[PDB]
Design a protein around this ligand. Structure first.
Ligand code: NA
Ligand code: NA
Lengths: 100, 100, 100, 100
């Protein structure tokens, strides 16, 4: 099928509270082809190697992937999701907005 | 990920009986990349009615697909599954064996 | 959780055409508890073969079950679905309407 | 279908480390009927009200459910899963073993 650029959404499972265990999610959706490089960053640095969830699926040849890690939010730490695909000229970085 | 040739299996859901409504299946498994051409054939012509399940994937990026159609078997008619992929030099035809 | 009466829908997978192999379905939805008796009838007589899907439930504990069989529709034959549950006083019979 | 007692398994998603955000799972499997009361305890007291995962399913009228919460393991704290079902005379408590 024809190439399609992924939509990237970065969010925490529950409202962020410093010192309270949570899980950070990077949902990459509606893309084609499947070959994708997804990394979760903590202060511009990759945390642990995590692959797509079992909840991840395919619909009308397009791909819908979810990557998640458990984390304790802190005041000075900055979180982001780095995504690289054939449809992108350079790797895209989507920052995590605590207020969203 | 690296290229992987599909395993092709052609079978009817229930033991074949002439004049008795059944379901013909073509199960293509353990392949990479996802782009695949799958068509169910009846003698000369291609069955232009064939449906498919959703494209399912493993953690190791191997794809699984099931193509199916409702059919009434008959002693004279010959059924087959034509599969084309990047790993194949020419389209592979797997005939349906009523006895297996 | 509290008792909930099932919604019964009887339909063929594709629009009915005499002599053309199809699937007759009986979709029992939004019920509680899970224990249910579902039978497909051909001219008031119960079809022996009858297959069923896996039991599916919502986060709120309502059940969704699908009962199906391969069939060839004919002009002279009448189809129905007999459903029995704790919420029903007597078994409910839902006739198959070809035009619905 | 006939009554079947659940098999209860309590485990953390990753090897336990004090002060490191994790997931505490309680997998209740192969039970019938569906009506079940599952609570995760911290020193004999319930945590936040947790519903079953979307990975939860049904197989041959039996039920397979997964309940999970965030949590940060600490040295003093004891974790357990309290399960109540019709097949049990009194609520069963399965303690979390860090080494299992
Ligand atoms: Na903001
Ligand atoms: Na009508």
């Amino acid at each position: 099928m024809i190439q399609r650029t992924p939509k990237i959404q970065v969010y925490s499972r529950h409202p962020a509270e410093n010192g309270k265990c949570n899980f950070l999610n990077c949902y990459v959706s509606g893309f084609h082809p499947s070959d994708i490089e997804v990394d979760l960053l903590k202060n511009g640095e990759r945390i642990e190697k995590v692959e797509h969830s079992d909840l991840s699926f395919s619909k009308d040849w397009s791909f819908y992937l979810l990557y998640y890690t458990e984390f304790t939010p802190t005041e000075k730490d900055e979180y982001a999701c780095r995504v690289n695909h054939v449809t992108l000229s350079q790797p895209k970085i989507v920052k995590w907005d605590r207020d969203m």
